[PDB]
Amino acid sequence: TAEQVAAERAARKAANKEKRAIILERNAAYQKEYETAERNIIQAKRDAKAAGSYYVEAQHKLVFVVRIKGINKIPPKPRKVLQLLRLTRINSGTFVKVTKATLELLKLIEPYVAYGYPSYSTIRQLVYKRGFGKINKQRVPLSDNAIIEANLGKYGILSIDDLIHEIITVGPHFKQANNFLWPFKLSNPSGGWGVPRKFKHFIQGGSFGNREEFINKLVKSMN
Amino acid sequence: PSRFTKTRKHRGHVSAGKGRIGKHRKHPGGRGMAGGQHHHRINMDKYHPGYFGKVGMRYFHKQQAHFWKPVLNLDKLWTLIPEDKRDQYLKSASKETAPVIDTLAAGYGKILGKGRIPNVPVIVKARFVSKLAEEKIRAAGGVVELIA
């Protein structure tokens, strides 16, 4: 027996050493993938400026929604929507793929949430610290890519940065990659909400709405 | 027994299980079958349709056993022949020595037509047999003998 189990271990130890090589491969390739893309966009603006024209950016495909309202006294149609977006608890948030299907699920929910367009960090630090996943109910922390690979592996996505990539880049399996993610339980903003009163719209009084890029300063302080 | 009964569970709660608003009074709605035509109408139709009125014909001094006709079917039949002999009689299949089954003396006296029987023949001693019953006994090569 002593050789037999040693064969499983010595090979599995080597299987992992190589399974970790697949990762360093990808994440370094992911690092370039982002570094070029933002550099592209940053340049295309300048070119168009030199040409006389204007670079109009692609509208955002990805949005992060944290529900800032309690669970009390909510009208049914918003109430049902918040459940379908998986925000049933205050100060919790999920990712949403922006499409005129879900776009109407927002804006109808607008009274009860603040949201916007999350940065790389914001997603990375959200998944690293608060990242959990759903396995037969069972909210499970992602402490190991093995957990992810065991579940999201059928889609690719064997890393934790494979999850992050599949989220920020949206892409083909974003439905299940995002649905795998348990909704994010967040603390109240460290340092306050910046407003006096939350439930005026961001444009007027602050919070409660689409604050666009300003969701990052908020979500990061709620993390 | 009492120790199992829910009214021991209710000791300490005002009003047993009976409610604060409606309590438990003496006879709201009236005793017994009262008001079946009025406030209990909805319950008498629906769960007891036909309950009210008359239908059909009376019978004075009617005595049952003028009517006594315990019903037996070819579905059974052969049960009336004890178990062991039932074998060898089925094995025989004879028109010469064939088993005699007296239904009236067996607790019966109308033979009906439900279900198949073997080709083994039977002498059916009975009263009041159904048309399809007999004809199925003719398929086994057997007869019916009316008696009283």
Binding site: G70, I71, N72, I74, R79, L82, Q83, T88, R89, I90 | D45, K46, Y47, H48, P49, G50, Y51, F52, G53, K54, V55, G56, D75, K76, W78, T79, L90, G115, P118
Partner: protein, 185 residues
């Protein structure tokens, strides 16, 4: 606070062990609980669940119901399993051989099973002969043949039968039972 999308601290409707105290029944469960867990056999799971059923859910499987099931094509030799008691039926005549693994067999059932040269297996014996329950044909008695299930859902125009003590004429055939007295159902 949570806005709950389903009811908290709800228990699933299914039993766990039986409600019966029979110490032998409790052992057969201890067997087949173990079986269903450590095998791939789905049959053991099925038998395990059926061991908790209540006498209303384990209606008698008649021998003729066993016989006709052996007349099924391809199942002819299989050892049939009934997780409840088995009854004798005089209505048949030529009854085949097999072997029948059940909880209980009525005296007529047992003795007439063997007259055709067959065994009455008891469920642990069946477990040892067939640990994965292979080449087994599971049989169920009718549970909607029951008396009480005749009166269920008694509405107007439902053609069901009413709870009734005596019966004849004079009993619930007049007003509402015909167009001639009131209405009909």
């Amino acid at each position: 606070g949570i806005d709950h999308t389903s009811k908290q601290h709800k228990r699933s409707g299914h039993r766990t062990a039986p409600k019966s105290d029979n110490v032998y029944l409790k052992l057969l469960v201890k067997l087949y609980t173990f079986l269903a867990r450590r095998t791939d056999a789905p049959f053991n799971k099925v038998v395990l669940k059926a061991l908790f059923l209540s006498k209303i859910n384990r209606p008698p499987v008649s021998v003729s119901r066993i016989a006709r099931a052996l007349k099924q094509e391809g199942a002819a030799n299989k050892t049939v399993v009934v997780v409840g008691t088995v009854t004798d039926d005089a209505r048949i005549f030529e009854f085949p051989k097999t072997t029948v693994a059940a909880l209980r067999f009525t005296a007529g059932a047992r003795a007439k099973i063997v007259k055709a040269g067959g065994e009455c297996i008891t469920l642990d014996q069946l477990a040892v002969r067939a640990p994965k329950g292979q080449n087994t044909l599971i049989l169920r008695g009718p549970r909607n043949s029951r008396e009480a299930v005749r009166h269920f859902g008694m509405g107007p125009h439902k053609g069901k039968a009413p709870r009734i003590l005596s019966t004849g004429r004079k009993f619930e055939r007049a007003r509402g039972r015909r167009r001639s007295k009131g209405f009909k159902v």
